[PDB]
């Protein structure tokens, strides 16, 4: 029942169980969706499709309000907003929009990490001789 | 800021707080690839004998 759902800004399968159906919302993983379901007082055995619409609204609101529902501060994928200074858990459309902002900040100060991203290289200090391998030969002639 | 061989003039911005001074003075410069040499591939290292 209810094969298709619509949460936040991503389609959600109803045939899969609640935790792993909610993982498709980007910015929410296997563990984070597990805590949210437990805090929302919703049974884990039943699938996401057969949830009541009142259960859906409880699940979604607790996602954008993790701190208000006694969720530990160290699950949040941002624990210190460098612009704001507050913990925040970011949902699907926000991480992509926010990812540019972090790259924009790094680029506009001409830092090394931002420069590496702009050039299109590994930024965590990886070795890049035998393992970059983006294109093709390039033979000897 | 000294970067290996020369000093790079960098003006500190309020957005630059929380990073090392080595961020803003690159030490290796980007790599602009040229042309492969003789030993770049297996089928090219053979030197002819006449």
């Amino acid at each position: 029942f209810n094969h298709i759902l619509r949460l936040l800004n991503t389609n959600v399968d109803g045939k899969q169980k609640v935790v792993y159906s909610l993982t498709k919302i980007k910015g929410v993983g296997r563990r984070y969706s597990n805590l949210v379901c437990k805090k929302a007082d919703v049974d884990l055995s039943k699938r996401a499709g057969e949830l009541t619409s009142e259960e859906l609204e409880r699940i979604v609101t607790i996602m954008q309000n993790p701190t208000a529902y006694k969720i530990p501060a160290w699950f949040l994928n941002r624990q210190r907003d460098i612009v704001d200074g507050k913990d925040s858990q970011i949902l699907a459309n926000g991480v992509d929009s926010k990812l540019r902002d972090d790259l924009e900040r790094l680029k506009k100060i001409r830092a090394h990490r931002g420069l590496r991203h702009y050039w299109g290289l590994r930024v965590r200090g990886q070795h890049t001789k035998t393992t970059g391998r983006r294109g093709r030969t390039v033979g000897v002639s | 800021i000294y970067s290996g061989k020369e000093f790079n003039q960098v003006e500190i911005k309020p957005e630059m707080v929380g990073h090392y001074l080595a961020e803003f003075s690159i030490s290796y410069k980007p790599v602009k690839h040229g042309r492969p040499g003789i030993g770049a591939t297996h089928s090219s290292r053979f030197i002819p004998l006449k």
Binding site: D81, D84, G85, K86 | P14, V17, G18
Partner: peptide, 26 residues
């Protein structure tokens, strides 16, 4: 998360609690 006016006059210990963990260790 602190305004720039007080940020430049902030004390050492108060500066510590805000900055990144690597900055704190230094």
């Amino acid at each position: 998360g602190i305004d720039l006016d007080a940020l430049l006059d902030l004390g050492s210990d108060e500066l510590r609690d805000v900055v990144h963990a690597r900055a704190r260790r230094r």
